Amino acid sequence: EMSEAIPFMPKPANIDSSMPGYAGFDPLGFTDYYSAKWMQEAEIKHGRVCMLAALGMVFPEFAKFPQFASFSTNPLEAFYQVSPAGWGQIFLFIGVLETFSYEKSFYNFEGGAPGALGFDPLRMSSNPASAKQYAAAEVRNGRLAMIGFSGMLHHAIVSKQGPITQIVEQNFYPK
Amino acid sequence: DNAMPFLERPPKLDGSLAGDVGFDPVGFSNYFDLRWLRESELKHGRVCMLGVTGLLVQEAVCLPQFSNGKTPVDDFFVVPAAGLWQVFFAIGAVEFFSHGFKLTPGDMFSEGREAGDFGFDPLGCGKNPDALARRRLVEVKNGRLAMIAFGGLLHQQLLTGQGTFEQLANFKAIA
Amino acid sequence: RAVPFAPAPDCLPENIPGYMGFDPLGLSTLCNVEWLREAEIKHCRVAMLAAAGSIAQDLYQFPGVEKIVGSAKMTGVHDKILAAASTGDYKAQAMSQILFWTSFLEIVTLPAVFETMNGGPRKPGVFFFDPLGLGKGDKMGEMELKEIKNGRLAMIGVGGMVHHYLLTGKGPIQFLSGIP
């Protein structure tokens, strides 16, 4: 049996079609050494943070909250323009949200599905076909947001502006 | 008949769908779901029939609460931002409710709908079966025509900048 | 169900006072239902006091306050009394007094809301406060829903009153009397 993603390599033994974004892609066999379900949970959390981060790098191009209206549209400067009381409140809120993952991982590790923090308020994923599609879509949009945020971060390092601004001014290359 | 007699007829295009003249050279329906493609074709078609009606009407009529653009495509740019956003969310509401909150190719057809049916016949024009067959063919062909026509009307209005009927009554070749 | 489109989660039991199938956003899946019920009863009662006080602070005012408060309406009175207390004024400590006693009351009634979640006998919101005995001696249960309905209405009404003031200096009676 060979891997779907890299057809000339053998299939990575510890990933399976059961996993939503499975492509058979583990050329360096991380799952051969680390727990596949731990890696699965880490990829989903990184994707969820990145999906918000990719929207966050883009969104104050359009509109800013009135209090932070004076803040810069380059995200890497608006990071330092926020007060430490504000960053402390963000860190506390992320801490409160992360207590549930600290309780899921490290205590009931084997009970559930990777990334399942009991957050389904609109009762989606009830229909099985919808649940299948949403599982794969969350993984794929999370991976895309990881790549996209990685891009936009380094683009803000080179051109000292945000994504849309760099595009509009056509500042695509190191000046 | 075969639309492209030199090419072999596509294998999945059986005559059951209306408007089938065996025209799929590029080779869709060999990769994608024909239910999805047909529902997409009717959606594009019905949108474009309303779109060409909108272009022709807005070239003449204007609601008193709205400004008037030079052309019906410049009519988009004098309607308040909130108005465009309200129409967008209203259409989104329709798209959610009419499709049973199942909007992706993985789940849109998992309840067994036929492509393009929303149970929409208040006047009961589809009461007759054979008349329904004829109007199915009429709908898909007028929809295809309105797709092309909308492309033509929009690009000519962008190019000349003088409407559709005004363009015809004041035709001025490319110089 | 309140919304045929989006019904209430199964987390919500249907035996609670004021259950009308309304939770389209699934907010009872995101927290303890006992905590949420307790929180809405407390919000209801605080808002009922706030709304009745907003109306009363317009129709009739307690003696002497016009020298300490002038003609400020509902949001303004809070800020102006705290302004006067910011100097050393003795006769402007109504805010500190109410804050002290409500904080003391919430401090000593604090274990109650944790006993209810822990499986305790007391139901959400019940402090057994029935001095007149009217609700107790008579069959009780209609008064619960009357409390919840008036409390929800009071929350929306406070919202209205405050924001109507934040736009126009009229209070409740002045804003209702005319129509700018």
Ligand code: CLA
């Ligand atoms: C629930 C019914 C409802 C209600 C109460 C309204 C109310 C309103 N609409 Mg209408 N609208 C509706 C449904 C509704 N809409 C639907 C279903 C459609 C699509 C078929 C539209 C399409 C539409 C257009 C095309 C326009 C409006 C505009 C307006 C607003 C004019 C205000 C103004 O001049 O200064 C207010 C000025 C502002 C800058 C504030 C923004 C306007 C607020 C946010 C309106 C909020 C309405 C609310 C979100 C309901 C929409 C629900 C959604 C499903 C459509 C007014 C509040 C006009 C507008 O907003 O111009 C400004 C406008 O051009 N509407």
Ligand code: CLA
């Ligand atoms: C919130 C809005 C919303 C949502 C959730 C949907 C949802 C859907 N649409 Mg619809 N659509 C919308 C708005 C929306 N639509 C509008 C405004 C138009 C133009 C009138 C269309 C035209 C349209 C066509 C022609 C087709 C779909 C299709 C689909 C499905 C595929 C999902 C997808 O990839 O697109 C999800 C889409 C979005 C998240 C946003 C759509 C916005 C598009 C790009 C239109 C952009 C605006 C337009 C150019 C100008 C409108 C001006 C007006 C607001 C005044 C899904 C049922 C396809 C389908 O069902 O066939 C299989 C299809 O063929 N849509």
Ligand code: CLA
């Ligand atoms: C959220 C509640 C709230 C808040 C913050 C305020 C705050 C204020 N009020 Mg308003 N007021 C309220 C409720 C409130 N009031 C209610 C419910 C009423 C009666 C309808 C009034 C009637 C009122 C008048 C007539 C006046 C004020 C005034 C004032 C100011 C001075 C303090 C004072 O004398 O209070 C007076 C408040 C009371 C006498 C309220 C007592 C009602 C209690 C809560 C009933 C409790 C029943 C029960 C036995 C208790 C349950 C026990 C159980 C928990 C164990 C201050 C801004 C004065 C001012 O300067 O405004 C211009 C003023 O003239 N208030």
Ligand code: CLA
């Ligand atoms: C619409 C008002 C309303 C109603 C119907 C209830 C009903 C109830 N309450 Mg609740 N409560 C309310 C308001 C109300 N409450 C407010 C505002 C407070 C905060 C002080 C409380 C605090 C409270 C506690 C702490 C407890 C209750 C309890 C109870 C229950 C048994 C007691 C009983 O039957 O008294 C019936 C009460 C009334 C009929 C209210 C009398 C209102 C009178 C008729 C008029 C109010 C005048 C007011 C000052 C405003 C004047 C108008 C203004 C514009 C000038 C019952 C569900 C107890 C419980 O759940 O367990 C037994 C309990 O422990 N309540």
Ligand SMILES: CC1=C(C#C/C(C)=C/C=C/C(C)=C/C=C/C=C(C)/C=C/C=C(\C)C#CC2=C(C)C[C@@H](O)CC2(C)C)C(C)(C)C[C@H](O)C1
């Ligand atoms: C879970 C849950 C629900 C929910 C929910 C929520 C809040 C869901 C939120 C979903 C979000 C925020 C998804 C965002 C994904 C972003 C992506 C894929 C961006 C990638 C960027 C890219 C590719 C880029 C780029 C760029 C590059 C690098 C170069 C640049 O010069 C330019 C460019 C811009 C092109 C609800 C509440 C409905 C209830 C339900 O019961 C349960």
Ligand SMILES: CC1=C(C#C/C(C)=C/C=C/C(C)=C/C=C/C=C(C)/C=C/C=C(\C)C#CC2=C(C)C[C@@H](O)CC2(C)C)C(C)(C)C[C@H](O)C1
């Ligand atoms: C389903 C349903 C019903 C319904 C309904 C509705 C609302 C039906 C609406 C149907 C419509 C609006 C059909 C429109 C078709 C337009 C076409 C084919 C394009 C024409 C233009 C062309 C060819 C051109 C051109 C040109 C180009 C490009 C450039 C120009 O310089 C020149 C030129 C002008 C020559 C109802 C409500 C009755 C009830 C029923 O129970 C259920």
Ligand SMILES: CC1=C(C#C/C(C)=C/C=C/C(C)=C/C=C/C=C(C)/C=C/C=C(\C)C#CC2=C(C)C[C@@H](O)CC2(C)C)C(C)(C)C[C@H](O)C1
């Ligand atoms: C088949 C089918 C049917 C049908 C049908 C119909 C009516 C089909 C008709 C289709 C038509 C008329 C298509 C016309 C396309 C025009 C194009 C692509 C030109 C683009 C211009 C460009 C790119 C440019 C440019 C340039 C610019 C502006 C600057 C200048 O320097 C010049 C330059 C030129 C270089 C129906 C509906 C009955 C259904 C049926 O079951 C099957």
Ligand SMILES: CC1=C(C#C/C(C)=C/C=C/C(C)=C/C=C/C=C(C)/C=C/C=C(\C)C#CC2=C(C)C[C@@H](O)CC2(C)C)C(C)(C)C[C@H](O)C1
């Ligand atoms: C429990 C119990 C006891 C007790 C007790 C107590 C203290 C009972 C008190 C009960 C109270 C205070 C109920 C008040 C509810 C207020 C409402 C519903 C207002 C809604 C506002 C609206 C709709 C509005 C408005 C608008 C207008 C008009 C003005 C505009 O400018 C603004 C706007 C347009 C928004 C006793 C002592 C009996 C013993 C007993 O044994 C146990």
Ligand SMILES: CC1=C(C#C/C(C)=C/C=C/C(C)=C/C=C/C=C(C)/C=C/C=C(C)/C=C/C2=C(C)CCCC2(C)C)C(C)(C)C[C@H](O)C1
């Ligand atoms: C005095 C004091 C302060 C203060 C303060 C306060 C108390 C500020 C007030 C805050 C409040 C209570 C805001 C209310 C929000 C409720 C809303 C918007 C209703 C939503 C319901 C909707 C949209 C629909 C409901 C519905 C309808 C139509 C019927 C169908 C069902 C449904 C769809 C559910 C300051 C800040 C001034 C500072 C000062 O130093 C001290």
Ligand SMILES: CC1=CCCC(C)(C)[C@H]1/C=C/C(C)=C/C=C/C(C)=C/C=C/C=C(C)/C=C/C=C(C)/C=C/C1=C(C)CCCC1(C)C
């Ligand atoms: C296949 C076929 C078979 C046999 C016959 C045949 C003729 C030989 C052949 C046909 C061939 C051909 C060549 C057919 C030709 C097909 C073509 C080129 C169609 C072009 C379509 C373009 C459209 C609809 C643009 C839409 C833009 C929009 C809506 C922008 C909107 C905008 C938004 C919202 C934001 C900005 C504001 C505006 C600007 C308003």
